[PDB]
Amino acid sequence: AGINYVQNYNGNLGDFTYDESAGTFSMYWEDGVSSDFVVGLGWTTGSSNAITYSAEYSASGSSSYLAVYGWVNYPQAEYYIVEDYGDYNPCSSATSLGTVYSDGSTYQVCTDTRTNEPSITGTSTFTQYFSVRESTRTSGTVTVANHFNFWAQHGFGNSDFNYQVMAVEAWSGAGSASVTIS
Amino acid sequence: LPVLAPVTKDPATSLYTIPFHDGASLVLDVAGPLVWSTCDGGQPPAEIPCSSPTCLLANAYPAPGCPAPCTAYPYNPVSGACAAGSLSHTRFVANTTDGSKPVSKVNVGVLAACAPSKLLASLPRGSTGVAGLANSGLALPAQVASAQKVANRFLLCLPTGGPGVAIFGGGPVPWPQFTQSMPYTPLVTKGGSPAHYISARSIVVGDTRVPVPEGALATGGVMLSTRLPYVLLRPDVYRPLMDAFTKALAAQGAPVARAVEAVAPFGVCYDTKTLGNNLGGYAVPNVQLGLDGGSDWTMTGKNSMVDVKQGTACVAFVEMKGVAAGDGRAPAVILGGAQMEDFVLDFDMEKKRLGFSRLPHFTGCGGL
């Protein structure tokens, strides 16, 4: 569907521009950042619709992700499908759930419990899910249903979605990104 | 190797503890100069006369309600109670670490003051005393440094919940994914105090610098504390900072912020139904302290608001009592526990600097 939601957490730490009707955004942080931002575009309510994107993503000098990002209302969850990233692979630190194959690559899957931390309903205890692409890329189709179905074997609600975006996150270093969601 | 202990935030008291030995825990007090606990046999009094250097050191910072073999005067940092105690040999039982994970069990000998059980009031259930982490010779970090032959330096990663991290002895800062760009600011030693102080040259609410009187923010003007979950502000800073915060908050088709009757010890509290949220916590004005060295210590809603009861959250800036506006003998700002939570903090008393890496929103000290 048409974009109807803008994700903007600390976009002001760099240069965040977007056009919802065109499905485009860019985020430049070449001066560097020293706090976490999460910016992007998507939908007020997520779904299992496939997301197709194209991006220029330069983050070798940054702790950063290019990812589908969103939340589930109940059971409460934060999730990422990481297509590419900078100097930190987020499944290194976390509990492994094995792998899922989708859209031409194996993804490593991990989860963590998040205790007394900010959430879409305030301070809460919830679950976090990551799928991290083994063959990183900056364009393609994410068949989100394959990820959500696999995570649903491990507690993911796979329904009752809150917002869902294609996002760029970074919290250290410098980089740039331009993304189109077709 | 440095020594690692897991840190628990006690729900009832909001105080942070580490296991000490025998299932007993101690409260982390970053301004406390002594390690003290209740004792029984097998913490026998040390062979320390009250003229020796060790005894005078143990009595170097008398608590307000306490004048002057050795007898020290352990201080409960929550209630302010103090009592006479003897110095005794005790064991700090933990793990070593080569980074952040445990490697081997270790038993570290430390000198602690033996306090009467009455001094435990207001401490967490299961705590038998206080682990002082101030910059002085009988605090826990200094004692671990001499006994374990490691650095006079420690790391804190205080949790909001789940097990956080305390490491005594230095080494490279772990979790480079979060700490590789760690900013540092000088640690300032203040006369008559063992506490950790740093210098803020500005305070910003949103994107707007808070107008403070000339000289209000001085060298060593920010103290660090684990005694309270909230920030204490000297009156000359309290007034402009709170006015800026409440004005900005009031100006944010969602509900508009609605003040409610304050819940002690706080002065300004809101109906939580009238506050939004974002990935940093409640959607209230960001506050930044611009520190010497050029980096900022940031506060978001998780740091600047405290949930006190169903329906009410209070602003975590509280005005100091018994301190006149502009009194340079007192700190301008005392940062507390919830402003240190989910930061990796490197207290380096050899290089005399504090490293402060705020973790990004998707992680935190708990479970790190």
Side-chain angles (χ1 to χ4, degrees):
Chain A
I3 296 298
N4 65 24
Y5 183 87
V6 182
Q7 173 60 214
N8 187 353
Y9 178 60
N10 295 331
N12 74 317
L13 297 179
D15 293 337
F16 178 44
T17 67
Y18 59 84
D19 183 336
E20 293 174 75
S21 59
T24 53
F25 73 90
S26 65
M27 180 59 175
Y28 289 89
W29 68 108
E30 295 283 357
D31 293 356
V33 298
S34 67
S35 292
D36 187 30
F37 72 76
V38 179
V39 301
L41 294 185
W43 308 273
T44 293
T45 304
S47 69
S48 70
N49 285 142
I51 297 167
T52 297
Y53 71 95
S54 188
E56 297 299 322
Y57 179 66
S58 179
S60 65
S62 186
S63 302
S64 180
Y65 314 131
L66 172 66
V68 183
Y69 174 76
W71 292 77
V72 169
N73 292 311
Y74 175 80
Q76 190 179 62
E78 185 184 37
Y79 68 83
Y80 294 78
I81 303 164
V82 178
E83 295 290 281
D84 200 356
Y85 52 91
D87 63 23
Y88 177 60
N89 180 334
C91 277
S92 57
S93 311
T95 302
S96 177
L97 293 302
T99 53
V100 63
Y101 194 89
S102 194
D103 311 290
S105 183
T106 294
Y107 288 70
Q108 288 296 334
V109 177
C110 55
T111 185
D112 197 26
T113 291
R114 300 286 294 131
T115 297
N116 301 342
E117 293 283 352
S119 78
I120 58 168
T121 62
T123 303
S124 192
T125 292
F126 57 98
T127 307
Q128 197 177 61
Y129 297 85
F130 282 86
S131 283
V132 182
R133 199 172 168 96
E134 290 209 323
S135 310
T136 60
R137 68 181 179 172
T138 61
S139 71
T141 295
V142 178
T143 302
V144 303
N146 294 158
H147 296 273
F148 292 170
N149 277 162
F150 182 75
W151 302 344
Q153 300 176 3
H154 300 287
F156 186 77
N158 201 13
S159 57
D160 202 1
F161 298 97
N162 205 278
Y163 69 79
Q164 178 178 256
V165 296
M166 198 70 204
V168 172
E169 178 161 20
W171 61 96
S172 187
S176 69
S178 297
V179 184
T180 296
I181 300 157
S182 58
Chain B
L1 258 33
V3 180
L4 159 73
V7 176
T8 296
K9 184 183 187 177
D10 181 52
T13 61
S14 303
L15 296 164
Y16 310 88
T17 63
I18 54 169
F20 192 54
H21 55 227
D22 285 79
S25 75
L26 298 178
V27 174
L28 303 179
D29 177 15
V30 299
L34 293 181
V35 180
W36 67 257
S37 60
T38 53
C39 299
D40 60 19
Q43 286 98 36
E47 319 97 301
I48 297 169
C50 88
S51 38
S52 91
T54 299
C55 197
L56 280 315
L57 174 50
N59 286 97
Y61 307 103
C66 270
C70 193
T71 41
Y73 291 88
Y75 175 66
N76 179 317
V78 181
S79 67
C82 60
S86 67
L87 295 176
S88 313
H89 300 283
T90 194
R91 313 301 303 184
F92 173 34
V93 181
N95 286 105
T96 54
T97 184
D98 55 355
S100 59
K101 304 316 299 138
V103 173
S104 312
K105 186 166 176 227
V106 63
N107 276 223
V108 186
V110 308
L111 262 185
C114 284
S117 64
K118 68 177 157 138
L119 265 212
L120 298 184
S122 295
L123 302 193
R125 299 183 86 269
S127 295
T128 59
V130 168
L133 305 204
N135 187 190
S136 54
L138 293 185
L140 187 58
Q143 291 205 65
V144 170
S146 57
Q148 188 72 357
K149 293 157 170 183
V150 294
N152 185 198
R153 157 147 82 133
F154 67 96
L155 177 146
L156 288 183
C157 207
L158 297 185
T160 58
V165 179
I167 300 168
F168 305 95
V173 176
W175 318 294
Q177 61 267 30
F178 311 133
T179 65
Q180 64 193 317
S181 69
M182 172 172 274
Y184 281 91
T185 190
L187 278 169
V188 181
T189 290
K190 277 201 173 151
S193 179
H196 297 101
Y197 303 88
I198 58 185
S199 312
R201 281 24 258 233
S202 59
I203 303 174
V204 177
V205 176
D207 290 297
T208 298
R209 170 205 229 72
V210 174
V212 297
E214 168 74 351
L217 303 174
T219 299
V222 181
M223 187 179 104
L224 300 180
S225 184
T226 45
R227 298 178 173 181
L228 298 168
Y230 50 84
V231 185
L232 290 168
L233 296 179
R234 201 177 62 210
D236 59 302
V237 179
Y238 178 80
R239 171 88 285 118
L241 186 154
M242 187 62 79
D243 286 349
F245 190 93
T246 57
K247 173 189 180 184
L249 177 51
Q252 300 178 14
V256 174
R258 178 179 78 94
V260 298
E261 184 169 35
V263 176
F266 301 97
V268 183
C269 302
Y270 290 94
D271 181 348
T272 54
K273 297 189 293 310
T274 70
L275 306 175
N277 64 239
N278 54 51
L279 296 181
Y282 279 118
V284 301
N286 292 333
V287 182
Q288 285 94 232
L289 298 73
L291 301 173
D292 275 355
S295 290
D296 305 295
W297 183 299
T298 62
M299 295 178 56
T300 61
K302 72 190 302 291
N303 311 295
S304 66
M305 304 291 296
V306 177
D307 281 311
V308 291
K309 66 191 194 168
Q310 186 71 229
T312 295
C314 294
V315 184
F317 297 110
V318 178
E319 195 175 23
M320 292 175 185
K321 298 165 158 297
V323 177
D327 181 0
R329 297 170 301 177
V333 182
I334 308 180
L335 295 173
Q339 301 75 51
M340 292 185 274
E341 278 167 9
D342 292 343
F343 279 67
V344 182
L345 297 178
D346 175 18
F347 289 81
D348 190 335
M349 291 158 291
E350 293 183 3
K351 293 182 172 174
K352 296 171 58 96
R353 64 180 192 168
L354 173 70
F356 56 106
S357 292
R358 187 189 170 98
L359 294 175
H361 87 274
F362 61 80
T363 189
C365 295
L368 222 205

